[PDB]
Amino acid sequence: VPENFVPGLDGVVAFTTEIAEPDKDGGALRYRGVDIEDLVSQRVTFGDVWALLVDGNFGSGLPPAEPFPLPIHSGDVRVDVQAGLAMLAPIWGYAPLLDIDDATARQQLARASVMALSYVAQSARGIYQPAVPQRIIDEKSTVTARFMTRWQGEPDPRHIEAIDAYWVSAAEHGMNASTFTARVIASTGADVAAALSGAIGAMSGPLHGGAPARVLPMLDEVERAGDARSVVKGILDRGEKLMGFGHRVYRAEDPRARVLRAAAERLGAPRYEVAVAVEQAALSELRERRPDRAIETNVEFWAAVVLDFARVPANMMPAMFTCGRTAGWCAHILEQKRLGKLVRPSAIYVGPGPRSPESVDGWERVLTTA
Amino acid sequence: VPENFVPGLDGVVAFTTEIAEPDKDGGALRYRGVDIEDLVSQRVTFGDVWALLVDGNFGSGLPPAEPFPLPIHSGDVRVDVQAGLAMLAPIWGYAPLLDIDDATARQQLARASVMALSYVAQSARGIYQPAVPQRIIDEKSTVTARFMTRWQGEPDPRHIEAIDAYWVSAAEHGMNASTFTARVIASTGADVAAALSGAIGAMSGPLHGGAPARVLPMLDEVERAGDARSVVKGILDRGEKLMGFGHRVYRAEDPRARVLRAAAERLGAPRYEVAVAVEQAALSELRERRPDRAIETNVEFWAAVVLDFARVPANMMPAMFTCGRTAGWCAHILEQKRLGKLVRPSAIYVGPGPRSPESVDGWERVLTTA
């Protein structure tokens, strides 16, 4: 029965999707056939990209969020939004996916998705300040602009452009751990709120990947010393590894990594000059010691640079990656609804054979009732 | 690219556990080699079966729960415990699974499991009665006995035996949707609280199976109407379906269904005679109409009878099934920790090819800036 496998569903095919195509051999990423570089160059906001991934066409963007203050204060922004979403079903009357039509599910997904963004902004601002007045928030026109106003009060317009570019680049990247979890839960017929809450739990894992790298301390060493090449040699020669660089993912430079770097220069990020020097120094030394391996910059390197430019703390960066990915999660949940197939793999028992209760270690220490 | 496959990972092998074996061809169920029906015969409490599944042997039972009144009151018992578990990590300082040894991981799982039972008992009791004094709860000896006391105040000892038998029979039944969800989340390295919260979301789905059946109205009609066959025939002749009967799961008889029916008879459940009479009439009529099919009684049929005897309302029954399954979830979470492999399948793109943004319908109603 062992059948000499490798564990972990590694390379197994489970679905056929029409949503998006990460073309790693061609070095491009397309949402419903549209390239990201085209979307960003044409100044398309995140609210409309959400509809494109879910519906398959433009036309009905993300609606404004509605007044509803956050009821969870745990000190961890991931926990606040994970628990807050699950509580929406009773108050708003969300039925199981098995009992509603496609149109109702689409509207429920949009209503809950924009509410999750509102929660993150409230949690970041904290309970030790009064809330931003609603009339001020209503002055803005786009969903992304509302998020920065609810958080910062008087945000910089350049910082709003940076956030809107990052969210587009992270909306959907195929089948990963969190996307798989959302589809598995939805296959059981549960309401949409439960599926989104469960996906956030999977996102919190360190091994999920895609979270902004811990390059902020490294960029501080170069800032003081004034020589980027010296610091890179020092980290490598004391047995450590470089944060933000490693093996290739695409054939070459990640399309997401290129657009983020272009945004940093275009908007005039103060820390841009130091960031470029670090990238050049790191690649020269890494490729010089192993001239046989393909070494390329991680997209997470430039994500940290952009988010820091918009005044995002380090302890808030994982939440920002969650906000953008809601577009991909909602699109896959709706596709899984129409499929109507439960997900259930199998397993093989290789444990002990039959035995009596008294033959197990510790039976002398148990008490039985009369 | 697609090569005529079946979606949904149906029949695929993934893990090869050592925990428990559902012997569907031999009609038996064994935990770590010990038969489920021997454990009930010798009055083994739920606190010790939890240790057997997780540790592989007896010796360290489940500890008492510490005072912690429920902070969430949403009106849905499932939502109350799903959100409450996730909030435990910040206040207790839980670390990611990637950063702790096995000994810490087990202790954290045991601490969270008994707290989940405490939340369910508090949620069921309601906000219109004062809490049970702590000194009264401390008089009981087993975890099951304290759960009933925190909820009902002065529980009947016969009702404690009924619940303690149901929880053993529902501790673990292999690789299902909820158990799969817990392992996937744990493979990312997240903390144990996030994994348990995610599994509860998958459990709430109607298509998961195992939730007690809605047979109570039918048993009410038979009590006043005299016979059982005519009531069963009337339901079948007017286009309805019978609750609690369907296609077989085991070879002939589900062993869990056998032990529950036996428990209802020992403890003198008032509805036993009416229940067993309905089962005989239901199988006879169903098998004569469709003689080519193997029809058997569902385990959910007798689970509803036993829980109703213990004064469990219908809308609380799905939560009771969650309480017992926490033993199996914790065992599989720990096993996945030692494996150290991420779970990540693949998918095949069959969507549209490259196109420009202007070539998508609905482009005319998108607003962009200069």
mmCIF file of N, CA and C in Angstrom, chain B residues 215-221 223 264 268-278 301-302 304-305 308-309:
data_model
loop_
_atom_site.group_PDB
_atom_site.id
_atom_site.type_symbol
_atom_site.label_atom_id
_atom_site.label_comp_id
_atom_site.label_asym_id
_atom_site.label_seq_id
_atom_site.Cartn_x
_atom_site.Cartn_y
_atom_site.Cartn_z
ATOM 1 N N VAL B 215 -34.597 14.834 12.626
ATOM 2 C CA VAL B 215 -35.597 13.780 12.734
ATOM 3 C C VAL B 215 -36.606 14.046 13.839
ATOM 4 N N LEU B 216 -36.428 15.120 14.609
ATOM 5 C CA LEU B 216 -37.309 15.376 15.747
ATOM 6 C C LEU B 216 -38.765 15.601 15.350
ATOM 7 N N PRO B 217 -39.096 16.421 14.340
ATOM 8 C CA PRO B 217 -40.518 16.558 13.973
ATOM 9 C C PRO B 217 -41.166 15.246 13.567
ATOM 10 N N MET B 218 -40.427 14.378 12.870
ATOM 11 C CA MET B 218 -40.977 13.085 12.475
ATOM 12 C C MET B 218 -41.276 12.218 13.690
ATOM 13 N N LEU B 219 -40.371 12.207 14.673
ATOM 14 C CA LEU B 219 -40.601 11.418 15.878
ATOM 15 C C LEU B 219 -41.753 11.977 16.702
ATOM 16 N N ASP B 220 -42.037 13.276 16.571
ATOM 17 C CA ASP B 220 -43.187 13.854 17.257
ATOM 18 C C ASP B 220 -44.495 13.371 16.640
ATOM 19 N N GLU B 221 -44.552 13.296 15.307
ATOM 20 C CA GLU B 221 -45.777 12.870 14.635
ATOM 21 C C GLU B 221 -46.138 11.434 14.995
ATOM 22 N N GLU B 223 -45.461 9.784 17.713
ATOM 23 C CA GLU B 223 -45.865 9.624 19.107
ATOM 24 C C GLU B 223 -47.370 9.803 19.277
ATOM 25 N N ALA B 264 -28.434 4.371 23.999
ATOM 26 C CA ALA B 264 -29.785 4.859 24.246
ATOM 27 C C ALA B 264 -30.627 3.833 24.991
ATOM 28 N N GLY B 268 -31.987 4.102 29.335
ATOM 29 C CA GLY B 268 -33.422 4.279 29.429
ATOM 30 C C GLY B 268 -33.937 5.552 28.788
ATOM 31 N N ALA B 269 -33.490 5.831 27.568
ATOM 32 C CA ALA B 269 -33.977 6.999 26.850
ATOM 33 C C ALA B 269 -35.469 6.845 26.567
ATOM 34 N N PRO B 270 -36.293 7.841 26.901
ATOM 35 C CA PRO B 270 -37.747 7.685 26.724
ATOM 36 C C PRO B 270 -38.175 7.435 25.287
ATOM 37 N N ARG B 271 -37.488 8.019 24.309
ATOM 38 C CA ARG B 271 -37.888 7.910 22.913
ATOM 39 C C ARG B 271 -37.304 6.688 22.216
ATOM 40 N N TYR B 272 -36.741 5.736 22.965
ATOM 41 C CA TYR B 272 -36.060 4.606 22.338
ATOM 42 C C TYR B 272 -37.025 3.745 21.530
ATOM 43 N N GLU B 273 -38.147 3.350 22.137
ATOM 44 C CA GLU B 273 -39.054 2.419 21.471
ATOM 45 C C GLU B 273 -39.639 3.021 20.201
ATOM 46 N N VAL B 274 -40.006 4.303 20.240
ATOM 47 C CA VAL B 274 -40.518 4.952 19.039
ATOM 48 C C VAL B 274 -39.420 5.073 17.989
ATOM 49 N N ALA B 275 -38.189 5.359 18.422
ATOM 50 C CA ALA B 275 -37.090 5.537 17.478
ATOM 51 C C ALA B 275 -36.748 4.233 16.767
ATOM 52 N N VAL B 276 -36.621 3.138 17.523
ATOM 53 C CA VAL B 276 -36.269 1.862 16.907
ATOM 54 C C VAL B 276 -37.399 1.360 16.017
ATOM 55 N N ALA B 277 -38.650 1.681 16.359
ATOM 56 C CA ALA B 277 -39.772 1.288 15.514
ATOM 57 C C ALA B 277 -39.748 2.026 14.181
ATOM 58 N N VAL B 278 -39.361 3.303 14.193
ATOM 59 C CA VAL B 278 -39.286 4.070 12.953
ATOM 60 C C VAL B 278 -38.154 3.556 12.071
ATOM 61 N N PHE B 301 -28.740 9.641 12.626
ATOM 62 C CA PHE B 301 -30.070 9.345 13.148
ATOM 63 C C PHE B 301 -30.034 9.125 14.655
ATOM 64 N N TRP B 302 -29.148 8.246 15.121
ATOM 65 C CA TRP B 302 -29.086 7.939 16.543
ATOM 66 C C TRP B 302 -28.316 8.984 17.337
ATOM 67 N N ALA B 304 -28.868 12.199 16.955
ATOM 68 C CA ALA B 304 -29.926 13.134 17.322
ATOM 69 C C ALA B 304 -30.735 12.618 18.506
ATOM 70 N N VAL B 305 -30.983 11.308 18.554
ATOM 71 C CA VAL B 305 -31.754 10.734 19.651
ATOM 72 C C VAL B 305 -30.997 10.864 20.969
ATOM 73 N N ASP B 308 -30.772 14.606 22.103
ATOM 74 C CA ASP B 308 -32.074 15.067 22.580
ATOM 75 C C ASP B 308 -32.358 14.551 23.985
ATOM 76 N N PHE B 309 -31.940 13.317 24.275
ATOM 77 C CA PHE B 309 -32.094 12.774 25.622
ATOM 78 C C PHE B 309 -31.321 13.594 26.647
#
